[PDB]
RNA sequence: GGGGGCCUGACUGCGAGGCCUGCAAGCCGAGCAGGGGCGAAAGCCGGGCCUAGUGAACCGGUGGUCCCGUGUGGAAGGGCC
RNA sequence: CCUGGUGUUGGCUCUUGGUCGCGCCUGCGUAGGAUAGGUGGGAGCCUGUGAACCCCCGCCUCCGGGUGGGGGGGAGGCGCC
RNA sequence: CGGGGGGAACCUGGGGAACUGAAACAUCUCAGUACCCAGAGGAGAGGAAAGAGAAAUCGACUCCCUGAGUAGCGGCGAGCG
RNA sequence: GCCCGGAUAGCUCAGUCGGUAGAGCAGGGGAUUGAAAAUCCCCGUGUCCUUGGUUCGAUUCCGAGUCCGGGCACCA
């Protein structure tokens, strides 16, 4: 591993697709899109005591950095 | 901040922040205006309709009970016994297809026409072309055609008051006298509340009774909450 | 975004305030800086801690004030000057008063704040108002006389 | 088949018993019921003078109905017409 | 790949549009003292102009005129009819 | 101080496919199956309820028989369950 | 099927009180046309796609009805 989160796990899976709708509107589901993909967050940082970083990931980030900001 | 009305005093009575309610209205209006003679207060309002597409165009009349003698003339068009009944009931214009003929000629002194099903053909087709889009021709559910010529003209005299949204969606009608008991003005305000409410065409979507108020002739103008 | 501010009032207008400046915004843009910190027990408390603080501070102030208000408004202030029967040769400086009450009688006060436009030196007594604590002024019957 | 009068059965409930057909089809129908319409009536009328103008099943719509509802009241939703 | 929303992607600011809340101001096809925008109340209204006579000044135009103000004073005007 | 390095099959999670069926085949299907992986074991797995279920009822988790192949999921089709 | 949009005389387009209609280019009649061209003068010249409706009175205003054009989702 080398890109999950830092403040927990948000690094993985995704199966999905579509095709089309038109249901409780006029009929059944134009059904189909057998597709697969990724799905994730972002990066950023601050300072320990003169010289630092963070890295981490998104939200978990914001709350967190706040947290150790507390110290 | 100073204006052109001596009414100004009455206006001071007039504190337009609240829409208050009916009976309150009877009282504060009765007090508000007794200028020359005694106030001829009236109620007026506007509904969320659309009178262009007549599929909401309303009118008719509730029966606000209380003696009468003035407003909206009507023609009792029929024959003998009906001339009897309606004429006596409370008619301003009375006769039959002879009156219809007179009108085709050059005599029309009645806003609403009520004819019994006995001279109704002559009324509607002879005078159809005459009363026309004036509002002066008889219609089977426009309080204008039927045998009870006597009953309807009767109420015309004992207490009538009708309905008819004008171009922009509003009606006007008498629902209490000036020096008239407050509770009274209230009750009539009510009978109107109801018949109006009924007329309320199914073509309304939302805030129908938009503005409902009591205002006088030459005098105050305050909304009323026909709820309380 | 409960941004609690020390150096702020919508600029370096300091303490007594807290506002919202959204996530990052307020965050690393307005407070990395060093003008405020966020809510938390730590901070909200903080405000409470030192607010209590000033409450007691000023209160106390008022108190000591009163002890002296009483003691002084109470007592008469007599002092010795040199002259004939009017103004003393060397002007009566309310400061002089100061030395006087101060270590000649007991309680002391700073000359500065007082009641004395110019040297007073007519002689005898005058009771004036030298405001000692911001809304509670000390008023006194001061007479110096030529001890001859 | 050509003309006039009056009128909706080009009705719902349905049918026994047969045409053909292996399937499903499609097709013929006295007579019993409610209910009317043409004569006064003996009776004809459940579309036309007849043999072609036709299409499963799914899916979903609308006018019902007022049967079902995933504890109970209702309701999304839904069963039969 | 291109591309609305939205997340890090913070600051001051010039501004311009739709909408509803209240205020103001408007309405000349034609006979119509008259540029009646309707539909209601509906013969009376008013005197901080002591007035429609006159004065200018504010404003909107299809000559007119409508409207809002400052003044000038000596029972007057108009809506009615 | 610890690991790492193994190991026929069993095992948990990580990622994860065409055939063939649906006598075509794009939903669907085989299936979360084959296989690449990481890893704890001697077996791990799960394991004391924001559960069941509607009786004022039960009571950890796991595996067997039964629960219906009904309840049902669906080019409501092959099928799956 | 949805929403935006065009349809009035031969050709092309014009009105929100509507409340009174055509106008630019061709066709007939008349002057400058000594020739024409050209120009002016004139006239003929019309439901504003269908239909009722609000409408005293609205063709540009209310609803529904054609043929057509542009952009979505329909049968699966």
XYZ file of C-alpha atoms (C1' of nucleotides) in Angstrom:
766
model
C 0.000 0.000 0.000
C 1.023 3.653 -0.646
C -2.184 5.717 -1.152
C -5.097 4.800 1.106
C -5.770 7.814 3.351
C -3.715 8.302 6.534
C -6.772 9.015 8.706
C -8.353 5.594 7.975
C -9.068 3.631 4.754
C -10.603 5.112 1.569
C -8.509 3.322 -1.139
C -10.553 0.894 -3.340
C -13.305 -0.763 -5.431
C -16.185 0.227 -7.717
C -18.569 -1.757 -10.004
C -21.200 0.235 -11.904
C -22.996 1.275 -15.103
C -26.501 2.285 -16.262
C -28.081 2.364 -19.709
C -31.378 4.184 -19.241
C -34.594 4.773 -17.164
C -38.298 5.573 -17.866
C -39.953 3.655 -14.996
C -42.723 4.876 -12.707
C -42.906 7.321 -15.590
C -44.050 5.206 -18.475
C -42.458 1.780 -18.296
C -39.572 -0.551 -17.450
C -35.774 -0.001 -17.312
C -33.717 0.402 -20.419
C -31.332 -1.929 -18.646
C -27.551 -2.018 -19.164
C -23.949 -0.818 -18.716
C -21.716 -3.637 -17.434
C -18.869 -1.273 -16.315
C -16.113 -0.998 -13.624
C -14.039 1.851 -11.997
C -11.982 3.651 -9.236
C -13.423 6.214 -6.679
C -11.458 8.455 -4.168
C -10.367 11.732 -2.241
C -7.529 14.395 -2.179
C -4.133 15.612 -0.584
C -2.726 18.514 1.695
C -0.561 19.517 4.773
C 0.666 21.744 7.714
C 3.538 21.882 10.329
C 4.875 19.878 13.422
C 7.267 22.495 14.740
C 9.319 24.337 12.068
C 9.518 21.744 9.219
C 6.503 19.407 8.427
C 3.786 17.929 6.079
C 0.535 16.021 6.513
C -0.259 14.193 3.249
C -3.433 12.425 4.352
C -6.869 12.590 2.700
C -9.755 14.982 2.336
C -12.290 15.221 5.105
C -10.882 12.815 7.589
C -8.100 15.252 6.927
C -9.798 18.489 7.880
C -11.222 17.163 11.132
C -7.945 15.455 11.947
C -5.463 18.191 11.275
C -7.752 20.161 13.428
C -7.267 17.410 16.099
C -3.460 17.249 16.276
C -3.631 20.999 15.868
C -5.114 20.664 19.352
C -1.962 18.506 19.728
C -45.805 62.865 4.514
C -48.976 64.965 4.478
C -51.778 64.124 2.019
C -54.917 65.201 0.081
C -57.827 63.779 2.076
C -59.741 65.201 5.105
C -60.529 61.539 5.496
C -57.108 61.834 7.078
C -58.697 61.563 10.493
C -60.552 58.365 9.460
C -57.194 57.270 7.976
C -55.595 57.734 11.445
C -58.352 55.355 12.623
C -56.913 53.238 9.733
C -53.757 51.474 11.050
C -52.756 49.173 8.097
C -50.401 46.652 9.714
C -52.988 44.010 10.506
C -55.564 42.264 8.319
C -57.586 41.688 11.506
C -60.930 39.822 11.228
C -64.630 40.100 10.220
C -66.666 41.216 13.354
C -63.810 43.502 14.428
C -64.312 44.888 10.926
C -68.061 45.471 11.413
C -67.220 47.587 14.453
C -64.196 49.579 13.324
C -65.842 50.289 9.917
C -69.174 51.296 11.401
C -67.178 53.687 13.600
C -64.748 54.689 10.765
C -67.288 56.204 8.429
C -70.729 57.965 8.805
C -70.032 61.015 6.542
C -72.931 62.335 4.430
C -75.888 60.101 5.426
C -74.667 56.733 6.811
C -71.810 54.748 5.303
C -72.497 52.279 2.513
C -69.608 49.924 3.424
C -68.918 46.998 1.089
C -66.530 44.058 0.930
C -64.235 43.363 -2.055
C -61.562 40.728 -2.868
C -59.334 38.973 -5.457
C -58.831 35.245 -6.275
C -56.014 33.273 -7.843
C -57.935 32.419 -11.034
C -57.547 33.487 -14.656
C -60.767 34.981 -16.033
C -59.530 35.013 -19.712
C -60.039 31.260 -20.024
C -63.595 31.520 -18.636
C -63.044 28.095 -17.007
C -63.085 29.874 -13.638
C -65.176 32.893 -14.486
C -67.619 32.894 -11.604
C -70.760 34.740 -10.413
C -74.098 33.803 -8.884
C -75.115 34.991 -5.409
C -75.331 33.795 -1.805
C -78.275 34.878 0.322
C -77.022 37.376 2.856
C -80.338 37.781 4.733
C -81.417 41.400 5.642
C -84.072 43.736 4.209
C -83.401 45.481 0.894
C -84.235 48.146 -1.667
C -81.165 49.182 -3.820
C -78.581 47.857 -6.470
C -78.308 45.640 -9.653
C -81.658 45.786 -11.496
C -83.198 42.752 -13.111
C -85.819 41.965 -15.773
C -88.500 39.403 -14.841
C -89.343 38.045 -18.288
C -92.347 35.694 -18.441
C -96.173 35.806 -18.555
C -99.126 36.455 -16.214
C -98.587 34.470 -12.963
C -94.774 34.814 -13.153
C -95.106 38.623 -13.647
C -97.266 38.250 -10.467
C -94.785 36.242 -8.344
C -91.443 37.880 -9.319
C -92.777 41.384 -9.809
C -94.165 41.263 -6.201
C -91.124 39.334 -5.008
C -88.967 42.378 -5.693
C -88.606 43.387 -9.354
C -87.186 46.587 -10.939
C -88.088 45.633 -14.550
C -91.096 43.373 -15.291
C -92.913 41.914 -18.246
C -92.253 39.247 -20.818
C -91.362 38.761 -24.449
C -93.205 42.059 -24.952
C -90.540 43.683 -22.688
C -87.979 41.622 -24.732
C -89.363 43.222 -27.951
C -89.320 46.722 -26.311
C -85.578 46.070 -25.542
C -84.827 44.855 -29.108
C -86.301 48.287 -29.933
C -84.627 50.728 -27.510
C -85.382 49.974 -23.838
C -82.894 48.187 -21.579
C -82.832 49.282 -17.922
C -81.838 45.955 -16.259
C -78.301 44.600 -15.572
C -79.405 40.991 -14.870
C -82.198 39.164 -16.727
C -84.218 36.444 -15.031
C -86.937 34.849 -17.165
C -89.121 31.848 -16.429
C -88.946 28.849 -18.805
C -92.154 30.194 -20.429
C -90.774 33.235 -22.311
C -87.171 32.086 -22.024
C -86.921 31.246 -25.736
C -88.085 34.706 -26.778
C -85.825 36.288 -24.077
C -82.617 34.380 -24.988
C -82.958 34.318 -28.823
C -84.855 37.638 -29.471
C -82.900 39.500 -26.829
C -79.902 37.193 -27.174
C -78.552 39.457 -29.896
C -79.317 42.527 -27.691
C -78.382 41.729 -24.070
C -75.374 39.869 -25.501
C -71.841 40.197 -24.042
C -73.310 42.948 -21.777
C -74.370 40.376 -19.181
C -78.032 41.173 -19.833
C -79.177 37.770 -21.417
C -80.618 34.760 -19.381
C -78.411 31.655 -18.641
C -79.699 28.364 -16.906
C -77.065 28.402 -14.093
C -76.320 32.099 -13.875
C -79.219 32.834 -11.586
C -81.014 34.125 -14.663
C -83.409 31.405 -16.006
C -86.076 29.252 -14.382
C -89.623 29.299 -13.053
C -88.849 30.782 -9.606
C -88.876 34.270 -11.167
C -90.690 35.207 -7.992
C -88.206 33.585 -5.618
C -85.111 35.150 -7.211
C -86.507 38.640 -7.842
C -87.957 38.295 -4.303
C -84.491 37.932 -2.795
C -83.444 40.798 -5.134
C -85.783 42.918 -2.924
C -85.396 41.203 0.582
C -81.611 40.854 0.349
C -79.589 39.823 -2.710
C -75.923 40.772 -3.408
C -74.344 38.836 -6.279
C -70.864 37.772 -7.447
C -68.876 38.368 -10.667
C -65.100 38.499 -10.806
C -64.188 41.465 -12.970
C -61.431 41.451 -15.651
C -58.528 40.919 -13.192
C -60.001 38.369 -10.763
C -61.959 40.235 -8.100
C -65.487 40.445 -6.724
C -67.490 43.063 -4.822
C -70.596 42.836 -2.644
C -72.632 44.265 0.265
C -72.127 42.212 3.459
C -73.364 44.607 6.259
C -74.821 48.172 6.708
C -73.022 51.168 8.279
C -74.766 51.669 11.683
C -75.720 47.987 11.286
C -74.991 45.577 14.186
C -71.349 44.453 14.230
C -72.218 40.772 14.647
C -74.517 41.355 11.632
C -71.942 42.825 9.314
C -70.014 39.726 10.469
C -72.746 37.198 9.491
C -73.283 38.709 6.064
C -69.549 39.010 5.491
C -69.846 35.250 6.187
C -72.764 34.191 3.863
C -70.652 35.892 1.214
C -67.548 33.953 2.522
C -69.473 30.784 1.814
C -71.270 31.309 -1.498
C -68.055 32.833 -2.818
C -66.007 29.867 -1.486
C -68.431 27.578 -3.321
C -68.215 29.505 -6.606
C -64.445 28.966 -6.291
C -63.847 27.291 -9.694
C -61.846 24.024 -9.650
C -59.400 25.889 -11.849
C -57.587 27.290 -8.806
C -54.102 26.121 -7.769
C -52.949 27.390 -4.348
C -53.729 30.656 -2.526
C -57.200 31.177 -3.963
C -58.840 33.720 -1.643
C -55.870 35.967 -2.022
C -57.082 39.295 -0.687
C -60.357 39.411 1.220
C -61.447 42.709 2.711
C -63.990 45.189 3.909
C -63.745 48.751 2.614
C -66.475 51.291 2.417
C -67.713 53.488 -0.374
C -65.854 56.721 0.373
C -64.011 55.698 3.546
C -61.669 53.116 5.115
C -60.119 49.988 3.451
C -58.934 47.071 5.612
C -58.457 43.406 4.969
C -60.362 40.907 7.050
C -59.378 37.332 8.005
C -62.759 35.529 7.259
C -61.302 32.726 9.352
C -61.951 34.346 12.783
C -17.065 27.529 11.260
C -16.726 28.668 14.906
C -13.642 30.869 14.538
C -12.772 32.296 17.886
C -10.575 35.361 17.566
C -7.904 36.908 19.810
C -6.228 39.478 17.622
C -9.522 40.008 15.663
C -12.602 42.297 15.333
C -12.812 42.061 11.459
C -9.163 43.088 11.269
C -6.625 43.172 14.132
C -9.462 44.500 16.330
C -8.836 41.679 18.816
C -10.858 39.456 21.232
C -14.576 39.485 22.091
C -15.464 37.894 18.778
C -16.119 34.733 16.831
C -17.300 34.390 13.247
C -17.514 31.998 10.339
C -15.055 32.023 7.437
C -15.824 28.607 5.942
C -13.432 25.536 5.856
C -10.112 26.195 4.242
C -11.044 29.900 4.027
C -11.137 30.824 7.679
C -8.790 27.899 8.223
C -5.425 28.250 6.579
C -6.235 31.666 5.180
C -7.471 33.697 8.136
C -6.132 31.697 11.092
C -3.059 29.873 10.085
C -1.994 33.424 10.404
C -2.232 33.674 14.132
C -5.234 35.734 15.038
C -7.693 33.117 16.348
C -8.305 29.401 17.066
C -11.466 27.256 16.740
C -14.197 26.553 19.280
C -13.501 23.360 21.246
C -13.706 23.086 25.011
C -10.167 24.436 24.989
C -11.116 27.642 23.258
C -14.710 28.381 24.306
C -13.476 27.662 27.807
C -10.519 29.998 27.244
C -12.943 32.820 26.596
C -14.798 31.837 29.694
C -11.628 31.603 31.784
C -10.350 35.055 31.059
C -13.838 36.685 30.876
C -14.446 35.441 34.442
C -10.970 36.852 34.890
C -11.786 40.437 33.956
C -15.086 40.172 35.879
C -13.134 39.521 39.069
C -10.369 41.956 38.095
C -12.529 45.019 37.628
C -14.794 43.921 40.461
C -11.778 43.782 42.794
C -10.690 47.202 41.526
C -14.035 48.658 42.428
C -13.641 47.025 45.873
C -10.213 48.467 46.888
C -11.553 51.710 45.529
C -14.437 51.515 48.008
C -12.192 50.744 51.009
C -10.348 53.958 50.250
C -13.514 55.927 49.272
C -14.870 55.204 52.718
C -11.661 55.774 54.691
C -10.928 59.101 52.862
C -14.341 60.762 52.121
C -14.595 59.908 55.749
C -11.528 61.722 57.162
C -10.621 65.395 57.090
C -7.408 66.442 55.437
C -5.439 68.975 57.281
C -2.091 70.333 56.140
C 0.545 72.972 57.192
C 1.531 75.843 54.871
C 3.570 78.989 55.203
C 2.136 82.430 54.399
C 0.117 85.375 55.668
C -3.645 84.977 55.384
C -4.265 84.085 51.732
C -2.041 82.298 49.208
C 1.007 80.515 50.518
C 4.310 81.681 49.132
C 4.914 78.422 47.308
C 1.678 77.132 45.777
C -0.426 74.313 47.009
C 0.014 71.394 44.628
C -2.659 68.736 44.966
C 0.474 66.568 44.611
C 1.508 68.212 47.819
C -1.846 66.917 49.087
C -0.572 63.585 47.908
C 2.602 63.553 50.007
C 0.373 64.683 52.765
C -2.412 62.106 52.947
C 0.084 59.587 51.643
C 2.710 59.197 54.322
C 1.698 61.907 56.692
C -1.688 60.329 57.391
C -1.683 56.843 55.785
C -3.551 56.027 52.551
C -1.753 57.190 49.394
C -2.857 58.367 45.941
C -1.219 59.360 42.621
C -1.040 63.083 41.990
C -2.036 62.932 38.295
C -5.749 62.100 38.478
C -7.278 64.607 40.923
C -8.964 67.983 41.145
C -6.635 70.908 40.707
C -6.418 72.970 37.546
C -3.709 75.410 38.766
C -1.813 75.598 42.079
C -4.406 76.242 44.742
C -3.007 78.422 47.461
C -5.669 80.820 48.810
C -5.532 78.935 52.166
C -7.881 77.316 54.655
C -9.964 74.544 53.249
C -11.703 73.634 50.048
C -13.232 70.201 49.586
C -12.723 69.053 45.972
C -13.308 66.063 43.659
C -10.291 64.088 42.548
C -11.681 61.146 40.732
C -9.579 58.070 41.873
C -11.456 55.181 40.226
C -13.218 55.918 36.826
C -16.830 56.601 38.042
C -16.238 56.628 41.787
C -14.391 59.938 42.596
C -12.933 60.750 45.990
C -14.175 64.039 47.452
C -12.481 65.741 50.364
C -12.360 68.546 52.918
C -8.801 69.804 52.701
C -7.540 72.698 54.701
C -3.982 73.723 55.030
C -3.407 76.809 57.032
C -0.406 78.893 57.777
C 0.903 76.867 60.684
C 2.114 80.431 60.939
C -81.966 -4.512 -53.746
C -84.776 1.123 -54.330
C -87.925 4.976 -50.794
C -90.440 6.853 -46.084
C -91.359 6.543 -40.280
C -90.031 5.806 -35.801
C -84.992 3.584 -32.772
C -80.635 1.677 -30.462
C -79.205 -4.990 -28.578
C -72.888 -2.310 -33.260
C -77.046 -4.684 -25.114
C -74.326 -7.051 -19.951
C -75.008 -11.994 -17.760
C -74.708 -16.191 -21.006
C -75.032 -20.041 -23.513
C -76.700 -26.018 -24.883
C -74.816 -27.939 -28.665
C -71.902 -28.264 -33.610
C -68.158 -26.100 -38.173
C -63.070 -26.922 -39.087
C -57.995 -27.760 -35.840
C -53.210 -32.090 -33.130
C -51.369 -26.949 -30.409
C -53.778 -22.053 -29.981
C -56.763 -20.387 -32.848
C -60.767 -18.614 -35.615
C -66.023 -19.724 -36.503
C -72.007 -21.189 -36.170
C -75.944 -20.594 -32.327
C -81.636 -22.040 -30.465
C -82.935 -20.915 -25.917
C -83.133 -18.817 -19.929
C -82.252 -13.792 -17.162
C -81.969 -8.451 -16.499
C -83.165 -4.372 -20.466
C -84.849 -2.065 -23.516
C -86.992 -0.776 -29.495
C -89.896 -1.572 -34.634
C -95.921 -3.354 -34.921
C -101.538 -3.512 -32.106
C -99.620 -7.492 -32.503
C -98.039 -13.472 -35.017
C -92.283 -11.768 -33.845
C -87.135 -9.447 -35.713
C -82.801 -6.752 -32.962
C -77.039 -9.271 -28.626
C -74.116 -4.285 -36.175
C -73.922 -4.463 -41.230
C -75.916 -9.471 -47.134
C -72.354 -12.837 -46.332
C -66.272 -15.275 -47.251
C -60.273 -10.610 -46.254
C -60.057 -4.449 -42.798
C -55.741 -8.987 -38.367
C -51.392 -9.913 -34.084
C -49.666 -14.114 -28.335
C -46.663 -12.990 -24.349
C -44.193 -9.706 -21.741
C -43.900 -4.475 -20.489
C -46.279 -0.155 -19.158
C -51.166 3.820 -19.347
C -55.793 5.340 -18.291
C -61.537 5.029 -16.533
C -62.569 1.483 -12.190
C -62.820 -1.380 -8.354
C -62.757 -0.533 -3.337
C -59.689 -7.285 -3.022
C -54.357 -7.052 -0.944
C -50.858 -4.400 2.169
C -45.337 -7.725 4.290
C -46.731 -5.452 13.483
C -51.729 -1.678 13.177
C -54.095 2.668 11.244
C -53.452 4.583 6.216
C -49.921 4.516 1.818
C -46.013 4.033 -1.969
C -47.196 0.186 -3.999
C -50.144 -3.183 -5.546
C -54.782 -8.356 -7.167
C -59.415 -8.636 -10.902
C -62.744 -5.401 -14.426
C -10.656 14.628 -25.035
C -14.439 18.696 -24.166
C -17.615 20.212 -20.792
C -22.411 22.640 -16.052
C -22.297 21.386 -10.199
C -19.259 20.615 -6.178
C -14.707 19.753 -2.582
C -9.844 21.700 -1.230
C -9.559 26.594 -4.454
C -8.803 32.410 0.362
C -9.205 38.453 -0.206
C -11.138 43.385 -1.266
C -13.939 45.104 -5.078
C -16.653 47.852 -10.142
C -21.077 45.908 -11.422
C -25.435 43.968 -14.122
C -29.903 40.837 -14.484
C -34.691 37.990 -12.870
C -37.871 37.809 -8.823
C -41.328 38.831 -4.987
C -42.264 42.426 -0.802
C -43.961 47.852 -0.282
C -43.782 53.406 -2.655
C -44.286 56.316 -6.483
C -45.722 57.370 -11.420
C -48.966 55.519 -16.228
C -53.544 53.991 -19.680
C -55.407 59.240 -25.979
C -59.178 53.203 -32.088
C -64.303 56.695 -31.467
C -69.369 60.647 -29.448
C -67.178 61.674 -25.334
C -67.450 70.144 -21.294
C -62.742 65.736 -21.681
C -55.600 60.943 -23.238
C -62.819 56.825 -18.760
C -56.613 51.305 -18.070
C -60.840 48.123 -15.323
C -64.201 46.433 -11.966
C -66.259 47.834 -6.563
C -68.301 51.159 -3.011
C -71.005 55.278 -5.230
C -73.710 62.525 -4.496
C -71.107 64.118 -2.455
C -66.571 66.202 -1.324
C -62.948 70.723 1.228
C -60.878 74.479 3.363
C -52.080 74.248 7.124
C -54.291 76.796 -1.165
C -58.277 81.112 3.829
C -58.952 80.046 -3.768
C -60.280 76.138 -9.759
C -58.901 83.144 -10.361
C -54.058 84.003 -10.896
C -48.291 82.828 -10.263
C -44.345 79.787 -11.201
C -41.955 75.368 -10.327
C -41.506 69.456 -10.424
C -43.104 65.351 -13.916
C -45.182 62.109 -17.762
C -47.010 62.910 -23.411
C -50.727 61.256 -29.346
C -51.388 69.691 -30.318
C -54.577 69.499 -25.914
C -54.003 67.249 -20.781
C -53.189 64.280 -16.657
C -50.489 64.804 -11.901
C -47.180 66.587 -7.431
C -45.505 70.986 -5.032
C -44.237 76.832 -3.283
C -47.350 81.154 -3.177
C -50.678 84.787 -3.972
C -55.786 85.621 0.526
C -61.488 87.410 1.082
C -67.989 81.716 0.690
C -65.746 79.914 -3.433
C -65.484 75.292 -6.879
C -66.291 70.942 -8.346
C -68.193 65.665 -8.165
C -74.096 65.753 -8.128
C -77.836 67.320 -11.500
C 13.419 -7.574 21.417
C 10.033 -8.945 16.352
C 9.665 -10.625 11.266
C 10.795 -12.350 7.668
C 11.308 -18.346 4.907
C 8.095 -22.154 4.149
C 4.062 -25.654 3.340
C -0.381 -31.244 -0.659
C -5.942 -29.243 0.944
C -8.708 -26.952 4.019
C -9.058 -20.838 5.278
C -10.105 -14.745 5.306
C -9.835 -10.798 2.712
C -7.529 -8.402 -1.426
C -8.657 -8.186 -7.424
C -11.076 -10.806 -10.400
C -12.626 -13.662 -17.020
C -14.600 -15.752 -21.737
C -16.757 -19.896 -23.005
C -21.538 -23.155 -22.798
C -27.029 -21.646 -21.390
C -30.512 -18.213 -22.411
C -30.782 -23.707 -29.690
C -28.821 -16.022 -32.087
C -27.495 -12.480 -28.094
C -25.978 -7.329 -26.285
C -29.584 -7.305 -19.894
C -28.804 -12.257 -18.026
C -25.307 -16.781 -17.877
C -21.890 -19.805 -15.634
C -20.311 -16.367 -10.518
C -17.989 -14.176 -7.090
C -16.686 -19.814 -10.383
C -11.328 -20.352 -12.655
C -6.982 -17.636 -11.775
C -2.797 -13.267 -9.750
C -2.156 -11.529 -4.696
C -1.646 -10.586 0.956
C -1.976 -12.909 4.920
C -3.347 -15.133 10.283
C -3.481 -21.193 11.374
C -3.431 -25.773 12.712
C -7.651 -24.319 11.375
C -8.866 -20.108 10.856
C -14.612 -17.918 9.992
C -17.997 -16.050 12.704
C -18.609 -15.275 17.697
C -23.413 -11.661 23.635
C -28.042 -8.375 19.535
C -29.302 -0.186 17.328
C -30.915 -9.398 16.215
C -35.012 -12.030 15.545
C -40.331 -11.717 15.273
C -44.999 -10.219 16.467
C -46.928 -14.515 20.501
C -47.557 -9.070 25.680
C -41.932 -14.540 22.213
C -37.478 -15.613 21.831
C -32.750 -15.046 23.300
C -24.360 -15.423 21.289
C -21.550 -17.539 17.247
C -20.682 -21.940 13.996
C -22.158 -26.565 11.363
C -26.239 -30.694 10.187
C -31.522 -32.034 9.046
C -35.954 -29.064 7.752
C -37.451 -25.024 6.402
C -40.602 -24.420 -0.117
C -36.845 -24.958 -4.368
C -42.057 -22.408 -1.920
C -41.333 -16.589 -0.098
C -39.696 -14.815 -4.576
C -35.254 -12.184 -8.316
C -35.942 -11.607 -13.882
C -35.166 -9.536 -22.541
C -40.690 -12.454 -15.178
C -37.449 -15.758 -20.373
C -32.510 -19.903 -19.039
C -32.929 -19.695 -15.110
C -31.598 -18.235 -10.138
C -33.753 -19.113 -4.902
C -45.089 12.575 -27.024
C -42.187 17.169 -24.724
C -40.588 22.290 -25.362
C -38.686 26.590 -28.917
C -40.085 28.069 -33.617
C -43.039 29.504 -39.500
C -47.447 29.805 -42.022
C -52.285 37.407 -44.663
C -53.366 38.546 -50.969
C -48.340 36.585 -56.660
C -43.059 37.152 -53.321
C -41.477 38.811 -48.655
C -42.436 40.487 -43.743
C -45.303 44.426 -40.207
C -49.689 45.690 -33.726
C -49.385 44.325 -25.668
C -54.903 48.728 -24.679
C -56.747 44.790 -29.592
C -60.167 47.300 -30.080
C -58.765 51.649 -37.383
C -54.332 47.372 -41.630
C -51.399 46.425 -44.649
C -46.113 47.917 -46.142
C -41.213 46.869 -49.319
C -40.948 43.823 -54.697
C -44.157 42.098 -59.147
C -49.853 43.073 -62.028
C -53.626 47.391 -64.368
C -54.369 52.744 -65.476
C -50.987 57.942 -66.009
C -47.269 61.787 -66.308
C -40.944 62.655 -66.871
C -40.079 57.988 -70.664
C -37.828 62.703 -77.170
C -35.901 55.924 -76.897
C -36.337 52.773 -73.968
C -34.047 51.552 -68.882
C -34.983 54.211 -65.119
C -38.585 57.497 -62.240
C -42.179 59.019 -60.009
C -48.226 59.435 -59.667
C -51.595 56.474 -58.842
C -55.059 51.969 -58.516
C -56.249 46.761 -58.278
C -54.829 44.762 -54.101
C -55.822 41.056 -48.136
C -58.836 35.022 -42.633
C -52.864 37.383 -39.789
C -52.623 27.952 -40.904
C -58.520 25.671 -38.523
C -61.809 26.269 -35.009
C -64.971 28.322 -30.959
C -63.617 31.382 -26.787
C -62.059 35.851 -22.773
C -63.402 39.912 -26.131
C -68.810 46.163 -26.880
C -65.135 45.517 -29.753
C -58.761 41.536 -29.617
C -57.129 38.484 -36.701
C -51.191 40.463 -32.711
C -55.421 38.085 -26.372
C -57.853 32.347 -24.097
C -58.141 26.692 -25.209
C -58.203 23.097 -28.680
C -57.504 21.553 -33.951
C -53.414 21.251 -39.257
C -48.771 21.188 -42.359
C -44.016 22.288 -41.438
C -38.844 23.250 -39.077
C -34.910 22.601 -34.565
C -33.466 20.059 -29.755
C -34.867 15.985 -25.923
C -37.131 11.269 -24.033
C -40.961 6.812 -27.283
C -42.219 1.961 -28.686
C -38.277 -1.326 -25.591
